[PDB]
Amino acid sequence: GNIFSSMFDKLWGSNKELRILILGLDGAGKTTILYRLQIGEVVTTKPTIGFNVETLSYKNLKLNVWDLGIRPYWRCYYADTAAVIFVVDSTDKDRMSTASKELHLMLQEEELQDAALLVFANKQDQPGALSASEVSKELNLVELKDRSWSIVASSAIKGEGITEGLDWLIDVIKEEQL
Numbered sequence: 001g002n003i004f005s006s007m008f009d010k011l012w013g014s015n016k017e018l019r020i021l022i023l024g025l026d027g028a029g030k031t032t033i034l035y036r037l038q039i040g041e042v043v044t045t046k047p048t049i050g051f052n053v054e055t056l057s058y059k060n061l062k063l064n065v066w067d068l069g070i071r072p073y074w075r076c077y078y079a080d081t082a083a084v085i086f087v088v089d090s091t092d093k094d095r096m097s098t099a100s101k102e103l104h105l106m107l108q109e110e111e112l113q114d115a116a117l118l119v120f121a122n123k124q125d126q127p128g129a130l131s132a133s134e135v136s137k138e139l140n141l142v143e144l145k146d147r148s149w150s151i152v153a154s155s156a157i158k159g160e161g162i163t164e165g166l167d168w169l170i171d172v173i174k175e176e177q178l
C-alpha cells in the first residue's frame with residue numbers, strides 16, 4: 001500500500017496536520033475505501049453516544065470516516081478539514097435522495113467553506129448501478145459553485161477508481177495548501 005503512502009507524502013510540509021473526511025450514507029462503502037489504503041493505523045472511537053468514528057492516522061494526515069443520516073459533535077472535525085470524500089452507493093436509487101440532502105447540509109457548513117470535494121460513485125461493478133454522470137446529476141454537483149469538486153466511478157472492493165480519484169484530490173489539497 002506504499003503507492004498510496006507515496007501519494008499522501010505529497011501533503012507533507014503543511015504547517016498544520018491535515019484532515020480528510022470520508023462521508024456518506026452507511027453501506028456506501030466508506031470503510032472499505034479506508035481499509036483499501038493499507039497505510040498508517042486505524043482506530044475506532046465513540047466520542048458521543050450513538051456515534052462511531054473510524055480514524056486512519058498517516059504521518060501528518062488524519063482520515064475520519066463516519067456514517068451520515070448533523071449532530072454538532074461533528075463540528076469538531078471541520079476545523080482542520082481539507083476536503084471531504086463523499087461515498088455514494090450507486091445501486092441504491094432510493095436513498096439516493098437522502099444522500100444528496102445529507103451531502104449539501106454538510107457542504108453548507110461554514111468551516112468547510114474551502115474543503116475540496118471528491119465524490120465516489122461506488123459499486124459500479126454491481127447490477128443496476130447509476131453511472132457517474134447520473135450521480136453528478138442526482139447530487140446537483142453541477143449547481144455547486146466556488147468549490148473544488150469532482151466525481152469518479154468506483155469499485156472500492158476491487159479498488160477500481162480509488163487511486164485515480166485520490167490522485168486528483170491530493171493534488172487539489174496540496175495546491176490549496178500552497
Ligand SMILES: Nc1nc2c(ncn2[C@@H]2O[C@H](COP(=O)(O)OP(=O)(O)O)[C@@H](O)[C@H]2O)c(=O)[nH]1
Pocket residue numbers: 025026027028029030031032033067087122123124125126154155156157158
Ligand atoms: N460490489 C461492491 N461491494 C462493495 C463496494 N464498496 C463496498 N462494498 C461492500 O458493501 C458493504 C458495505 O461497505 P462498507 O465500506 O463497509 O460501508 P460503509 O463504510 O458503511 O459505507 C461491504 O460488505 C463491502 O464489501 C463496491 O464498490 N462494490
